[PDB]
Amino acid sequence: VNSFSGYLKLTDNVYIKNADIVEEAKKVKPTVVVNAANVYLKHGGGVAGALNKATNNAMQVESDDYIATNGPLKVGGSCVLSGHNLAKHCLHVVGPNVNKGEDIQLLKSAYENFNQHEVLLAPLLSAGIFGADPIHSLRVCVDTVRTNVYLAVFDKNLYDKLVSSFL
Ligand SMILES: O=C1CC[C@@H](c2ccccc2)N1Nc1ncnc2[nH]c3cc(F)ccc3c12
């Protein structure tokens, strides 16, 4: 048993809710919150900009030090950093950005990072400003992640479409 509340169960291990991931993280304080990161960990907009804003820019300060030491992530890759006031840890995962012409095939590799964590609160990778089809992202999530994932979908109309179209 865990404290995630109000989720619809899609499969044995995937759950979904219409929620703001920032507000969800603040309430639950999960062990792991996933950020929709880019390779530079520049948290300007989308989920990343919102998570970073909620940390009062501490996520960005930590991220800039990480990049200065280690260089950029790979598309499809991840790193574990602090969750600040939102979670114990933040798993920064880079899904492909279609608006940069990145290979959508890399979305499966991106979701594989979730399997290193038993339970996660996460957004749909490559959705939103990353330009992929969220229905496709949900399918890849369900077919790739084997650990317990709680998906927060900000947009109510999209949440309803994702549920109603789920196979
Ligand atoms: O609704 C959806 C489906 C796709 C996904 C997404 C992913 C990367 C970039 C943009 C959008 N996304 N966005 C969110 N998902 C969950 N909680 C969120 N809190 C936010 C607060 C904000 F200021 C802006 C957006 C979100 C948000």
From Swiss-Prot:
Macro domain spans which residues? 1-167
Topologically, how does it sit relative to the membrane?
A: Multi-pass membrane protein
Report which reactions are catalysed by this protein: Thiol-dependent hydrolysis of ester, thioester, amide, peptide and isopeptide bonds formed by the C-terminal Gly of ubiquitin (a 76-residue protein attached to proteins as an intracellular targeting signal)
Activity regulation reads: Inhibited in vitro by GRL-0617.
Q: What is the superkingdom listed in this entry's lineage?
A: Viruses
The subcellular location is: Host endoplasmic reticulum membrane
| Its biological purpose | Responsible for the cleavages located at the N-terminus of the replicase polyprotein. Participates together with nsp4 in the assembly of virally-induced cytoplasmic double-membrane vesicles necessary for viral replication. Antagonizes innate immune induction of type I interferon by blocking the phosphorylation, dimerization and subsequent nuclear translocation of host IRF3. Also prevents host NF-kappa-B signaling. In addition, PL-PRO possesses a deubiquitinating/deISGylating activity and processes both 'Lys-48'- and 'Lys-63'-linked polyubiquitin chains from cellular substrates.
Q: How does it assemble?
A: May form homohexamers. Interacts with N protein.
Q: What is this protein called?
A: Papain-like protease nsp3
Q: Name the source organism.
A: Severe acute respiratory syndrome coronavirus 2 (2019-nCoV)
Taxonomic placement? Viruses, Riboviria, Orthornavirae, Pisuviricota, Pisoniviricetes
